[PDB]
């Protein structure tokens, strides 16, 4: 149903993911670092790409929640690992 592909430019202070949800589109996508108590809003880019720019270094694994345009809300824990690979697709 839902996949997260790590996009180029992703580094310790920038996470870029191509999010593809089958039969729907993302209205909002958020991430939470394994260590972190707070969800952070990602910014919608072109072609399903969502990005987050961090003041401090980001450390995965990364949890995501989202809201689809049709109104579906979900959360997926530890979808993208700490030591992720750019170009790799991660799925629940």
């Amino acid at each position: 149903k839902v996949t997260f592909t790590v996009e180029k430019g992703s580094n310790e202070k920038h996470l870029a993911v191509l999010v593809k949800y089958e039969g729907d589109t993302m209205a909002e996508v958020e991430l939470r670092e394994h260590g972190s108590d707070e969800w952070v809003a990602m910014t919608k880019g072109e072609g399903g790409v969502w990005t987050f720019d961090s003041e401090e270094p980001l450390q995965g694994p990364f949890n995501f929640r989202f809201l689809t345009e049709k109104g579906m809300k979900n959360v997926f824990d530890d979808v993208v690992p700490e030591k992720y690979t750019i170009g790799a697709t991660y799925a629940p």
Epitope: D37, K73, N74, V75, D77, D78, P92
Partner: antibody, heavy 117, light 108 residues
Framework: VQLLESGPGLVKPAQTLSLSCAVS??????????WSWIRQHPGKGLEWIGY???????YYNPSLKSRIAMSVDTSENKFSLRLNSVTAADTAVYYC??????????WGQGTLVTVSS | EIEMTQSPSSLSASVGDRVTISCRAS??????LNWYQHKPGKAPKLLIY???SLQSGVPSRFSGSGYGTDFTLTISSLQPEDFASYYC?????????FGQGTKVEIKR
């Protein structure tokens, strides 16, 4: 999707309170949700116990975490709570609930547990 | 930790009254804000999410507003079955902190 609490309504002090929540109309193994336990003690508000992701990740109320163990069983489509070393302060109505990342949209009916004899 | 504080603690209002209940977050939480109704002996019921979205099947008399710190649940025309405790809840943090509850009683 529907949730139903089951387990003893009477637990002896210092023993473990065990409850299970049976999920129907949906598969826990599919992911997408945190599976939650929330309770209410008599004159008090709603208190978080904790929540668990089906992969195993668990999030506990810090004031209870030492006594709390939650589990999930994907094969039986249920998730459970064990709260050790209970006292009368754990007498409460215990609710299981589904958390979609944002909201607790589906709840069980609640089950009373009296810490006992 | 985020603290969620509701006002008033309790109120009595008549059938047909417009009733409002407030919820204040200790830090900015945008619209990461839900409202629940809890009738004793029943499961809590999600009324509102994302500050102003009405949960499917919840009656139209319930509405929500606000952004950031101060939020308001409105019951546009109170019905006698609406006595309950009502709870806000933040969804910015992984604690999903509940407010302390506001008890609504029916004046007659």
């Amino acid at each position: 999707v529907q949730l139903l609490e089951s387990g003893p309504g009477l637990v002896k002090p210092a023993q473990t309170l065990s409850l299970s929540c049976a999920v129907s109309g949906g598969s826990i193994r599919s992911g997408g949700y945190y599976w939650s336990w929330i309770r209410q003690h008599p004159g008090k508000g709603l208190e978080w116990i904790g929540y668990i992701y089906h992969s195993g990740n668990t999030y506990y109320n810090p004031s209870l975490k030492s006594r709390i163990a939650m589990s999930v069983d994907t094969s039986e489509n249920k998730f459970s709570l064990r709260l050790n070393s209970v006292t009368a302060a754990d007498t409460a109505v215990y609710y299981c609930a589904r958390l979609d990342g944002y909201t607790l949209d589906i709840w069980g009916q609640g089950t009373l547990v009296t810490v006992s004899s | 930790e985020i603290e969620m504080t509701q006002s008033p603690s309790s109120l009595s209002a008549s059938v047909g009254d417009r009733v409002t209940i407030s919820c204040r977050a200790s830090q900015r939480i945008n619209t990461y804000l839900n409202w629940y109704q809890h009738k004793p002996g029943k499961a809590p019921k999600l009324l509102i999410y994302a500050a102003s979205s009405l949960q499917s099947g919840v009656p139209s008399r319930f509405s929500g507003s606000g952004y950031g710190t101060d939020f308001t649940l409105t019951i546009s025309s109170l019905q006698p079955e609406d006595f309950a405790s009502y709870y806000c809840q933040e969804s910015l943090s992984a604690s999903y902190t509940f407010g302390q509850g506001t008890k609504v009683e029916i004046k007659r």
